[PDB]
Structure formats: structure tokens, C-alpha cells
Amino acid sequence: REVKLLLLGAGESGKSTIVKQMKIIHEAGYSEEECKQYKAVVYSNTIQSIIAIIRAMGRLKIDFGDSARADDARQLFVLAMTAELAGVIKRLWKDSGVQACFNRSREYQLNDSAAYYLNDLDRIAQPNYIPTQQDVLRTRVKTTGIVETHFTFKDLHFKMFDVGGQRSERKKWIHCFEGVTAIIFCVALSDYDLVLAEDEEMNRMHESMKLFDSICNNKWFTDTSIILFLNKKDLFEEKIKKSPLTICYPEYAGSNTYEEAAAYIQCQFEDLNKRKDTKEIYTHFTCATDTKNVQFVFDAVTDVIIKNNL
Amino acid sequence: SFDLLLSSKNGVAAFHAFLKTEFSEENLEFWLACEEFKKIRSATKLASRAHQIFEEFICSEAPKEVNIDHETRELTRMNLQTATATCFDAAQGKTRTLMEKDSYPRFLKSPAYRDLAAQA
Numbered sequence: 001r002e003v004k005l006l007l008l009g010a011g012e013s014g015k016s017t018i019v020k021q022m023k024i025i026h027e028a029g030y031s032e033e034e035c036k037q038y039k040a041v042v043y044s045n046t047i048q049s050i051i052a053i054i055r056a057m058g059r060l061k062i063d064f065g066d067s068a069r070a071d072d073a074r075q076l077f078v079l080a081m082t083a084e085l086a087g088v089i090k091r092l093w094k095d096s097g098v099q100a101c102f103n104r105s106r107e108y109q110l111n112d113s114a115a116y117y118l119n120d121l122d123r124i125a126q127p128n129y130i131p132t133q134q135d136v137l138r139t140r141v142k143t144t145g146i147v148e149t150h151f152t153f154k155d156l157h158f159k160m161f162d163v164g165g166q167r168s169e170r171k172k173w174i175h176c177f178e179g180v181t182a183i184i185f186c187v188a189l190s191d192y193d194l195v196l197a198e199d200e201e202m203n204r205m206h207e208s209m210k211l212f213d214s215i216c217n218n219k220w221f222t223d224t225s226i227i228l229f230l231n232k233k234d235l236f237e238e239k240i241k242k243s244p245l246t247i248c249y250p251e252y253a254g255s256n257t258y259e260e261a262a263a264y265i266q267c268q269f270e271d272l273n274k275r276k277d278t279k280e281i282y283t284h285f286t287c288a289t290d291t292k293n294v295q296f297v298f299d300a301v302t303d304v305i306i307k308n309n310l
Numbered sequence: 311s312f313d314l315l316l317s318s319k320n321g322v323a324a325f326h327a328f329l330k331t332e333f334s335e336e337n338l339e340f341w342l343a344c345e346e347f348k349k350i351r352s353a354t355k356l357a358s359r360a361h362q363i364f365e366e367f368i369c370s371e372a373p374k375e376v377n378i379d380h381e382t383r384e385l386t387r388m389n390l391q392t393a394t395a396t397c398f399d400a401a402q403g404k405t406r407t408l409m410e411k412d413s414y415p416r417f418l419k420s421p422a423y424r425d426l427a428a429q430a
């Protein structure tokens with residue numbers, strides 16, 4: 001009864017995180033040793049996030065609230081964990097000019113976990129620091145290529161192939177299109193106001209939509225269960241009152257509130273289906289980093305993968 | 311360390327075989343294309359070779375196109391205007407990190423290597 005499953009989606013939509021949530025759910029969590037291995041990544045994720053904001057300040061021409069931060073900024077660039085760097089990083093983060101820039105992250109490229117790590121510097125910067133399960137989940141590593149991983153859930157064994165979402169990775173996707181039982185297609189809801197990291201002229205949501213039009217309606221998958229994860233709902237929730245959806249959909253007559261705007265995104269993607277009589281997009285709003293939520297969604301998915309394949 | 315792996319003949323070939331399994335070999339190739347390129351002292355050969363490396367790995371319609379952001383790409387395109395030895399340092403660092411962070415750890419847990427260390 002071996003099932004073949006694909007995680008597809010544009011870059012940073014959250015595929016690799018769902019793969020992590022399998023290791024946690026359907027194996028038995030992360031060890032402590034395994035967590036201590038993600039130190040470097042968390043530290044590097046943190047250092048990269050803050051560099052990102054500061055370089056944006058010179059581009060966007062935003063002043064520090066306090067001019068002595070320039071001197072920390074200098075040190076930051078040169079240093080890239082230790083006490084010196086932590087202090088530097090903290091001081092930068094608390095600065096009001098830095099925060100004005102962070103609140104304009106849509107105009108440049110910033111890791112979504114920035115706020116999470118930077119707001120937790122005190123814990124992270126400790127010498128005897130061991131990442132938590134969530135810290136690990138929050139980590140960002142660009143996936144390059146195609147990673148196959150095997151899994152056994154309650155009623156299914158899964159061959160699960162994780163791929164890279166960037167444009168240069170999409171050539172490679174054709175290697176795992178054969179005999180595909182199900183495709184979980186990730187979309188980062190929080191991308192509606194952002195541009196692509198590999199094209200600054202291209203809105204990330206319009207990118208995911210074109211990508212989805214082509215997978216949803218592809219001849220290869222007439223017999224595959226198309227599952228649509230509307231992901232990063234937590235990030236979207238705290239975005240939407242600050243930045244309007246009209247950035248992404250000029251047509252939009254509805255309120256810039258979480259549920260209605262989320263219902264609207266959903267319909268846009270689901271409207272890309274060209275055979276609605278015969279094909280069903282199974283949609284789920286997910287927070288990839290929230291184990292409990294990904295556990296409940298994966299039960300609902302599995303059921304569809306039995307009902308539609310036996 | 312990862313720097314050791316990239317220095318040895320054996321290591322590189324073994325790491326290549328693995329990257330082939332994950333369809334990400336273009337990364338290592340470019341990185342090796344960059345370590346040859348920078349040894350070139352002549353400003354003409356640099357000139358030409360820069361157009362070759364860029365045509366294969368960097369360009370948006372490239373056959374072995376590597377995963378790098380828009381900024382690093384277009385910077386490397388302006389670095390062609392006069393190809394010096396450092397022309398690709400930015401693109402080469404992005405790519406090194408991509409291999410170091412993502413696929414190097416899987417390689418250390420691969421049977422390809424697991425066996426060849428067990429030999430070691």
C-alpha cells in the first residue's frame with residue numbers, strides 16, 4: 001500500500017517545514033543532540049535576518065533613531081555567536097530606525113523567522129543554549145534539488161519527495177512526476193505583498209498562482225489528489241491589518257481582515273482549476289510551524305488519500 | 311569540516327555522485343568552474359570565460375542554472391562589464407552556502423559516504 005507524495009510550491013512556501021513535522025509527528029520528535037545541531041542554523045538565520053534589515057536602510061534611506069547604531073552596524077557586517085555580536089544585534093533590533101525598516105520588509109527580502117529569533121535573543125545568545133523543537137521548525141535552509149524521505153503514518157506508508165521552489169529548481173520536478181498519488185501544494189499566504197527573491201518585478205502570490213494553474217491542470221495529475229495548503233496563516237493574520245491585499249489583487253472590494261481575505265485568496269487559486277466538474281482541490285489553511293495543526297490537517301489529508309485510492 | 315571535502319580529489323567526486331542523486335550537481339560544478347576561472351591571469355581569457363560561466367550557470371535561461379537571488383545575479387552581470395578574477399565571488403559564496411547548509415549534511419548521512427568512511 002505504498003503511497004507516493006509530492007511537496008510542490010514556490011520558494012519559501014513551507015515544504016521543508018512540513019517534512020520536519022513528519023519527523024516529529026510520525027517518528028518521535030527531535031532528540032536533544034539533534035537540536036544542538038541546529039544551533040549554527042539558528043545563529044546564522046538570526047545574523048542573516050538582521051543584516052537584511054540594515055542593508056535595506058541604506059537602500060531605502062532610513063535613519064537610525066540613535067546615530068551610535070551606525071557603529072554597531074559596522075561591527076555586525078564585519079563580525080559575520082558571542083557576547084559582542086549579541087549585544088550589537090540586540091541594540092540594533094531595539095533601535096526605532098531599525099524597526100521602521102523591519103515594518104517595511106515587503107520592499108526587500110527578509111526571512112519570516114526574523115521577528116521570532118530576534119525577539120528571543122536573550123535565550124538564544126546564552127552559552128548553554130539548546131534549540132527548542134519550535135526553534136528547529138523556524139529554521140531556514142534553502143532546499144536545492146529533490147529530497148526523498150520515507151514515512152509510516154497510522155494507516156499509510158509514504159514515499160515523500162521534497163523539492164526546491166525557486167525557478168531554477170523547477171526543471172528538476174519532472175523526475176518525480178510518475179505514478180504520483182498526491183501533491184500537497186504549499187502557498188505562503190503572507191506572500192501577497194512581497195516580490196520574488198529571484199525576480200524583484202514579480203509578485204510572489206501571482207507567481208504561486210501561475211505555478212498552481214500549471215500543476216492543478218497538468219495532464220500528469222488527472223489521477224492525483226491535488227491538495228492545497230494555504231500556509232503561514234499565522235503570519236498572514238498579523239500582516240493583513242497592516243498591509244492591504246489590493247497590493248496583490250487590485251480588484252479586491254473586501255475588508256483587509258484575516259478570514260475574508262483568506263477566503264478570497266483561496267477562491268483565486270481554486271478558480272485556476274479548469275475541470276471543476278471532475279477534479280476537486282482539497283484546501284486546508286495551515287501553520288506549518290504548529291505541530292498540533294499540521295497533525296490535524298494530515299489526518300484529513302490521509303483520509304482523502306484512502307477514499308480516493310482504494 | 312566542509313572545506314576539507316571541497317579540497318580533495320576523492321571527496322569532490324564522491325560528493326558529486328551524491329549531488330547527482332538529488333539533482334543538485336550544478337551547484338558543485340559552478341563552484342569548481344569558479345576555482346578554475348580565478349586562476350586565469352590574462353584579461354582576455356577571463357573576458358571570454360566569464361561569458362561562458364555566466365551563460366551556463368547564472369543566466370535566467372541557463373542550462374545548469376544555479377539557485378541564487380536576483381541581487382546576486384544582476385551584480386554578477388554587472389561584474390562581467392570588465393571580468394576580473396573576483397567576478398563570481400558573490401555568486402560562488404551563495405552557492406557554497408547552499409551546498410554547506412542544505413545538502414552536505416545529508417551527504418554525511420548518505421550510504422555513498424557512510425560506506426567509504428567505514429572503509430576509512
Ligand SMILES: Nc1nc2c(ncn2[C@@H]2O[C@H](COP(=O)(O)OP(=O)(O)O)[C@@H](O)[C@H]2O)c(=O)[nH]1
Pocket residue numbers: 009010011012013014015016017018112113137138139140141142143164165186231232233234235286287288289290
Ligand atoms: N510562522 C510560520 N513560519 C513558517 C510556516 N511555514 C514555513 N515557515 C518558516 O518559513 C521558512 C520557509 O519554510 P521552508 O519549509 O524552508 O520553505 P520551502 O522552500 O518551501 O521548503 C522557514 O524558516 C520556516 O520555519 C508557517 O506556517 N508559519
Ligand code: ALF
Pocket residue numbers: 009010011012013015016141142143144163164165166
Ligand atoms: F522552496 Al525552498 F528552500 F525555497 F524548499
Ligand SMILES: [Mg+2]
Pocket residue numbers: 015016017141142143163164
Ligand atoms: Mg525547502
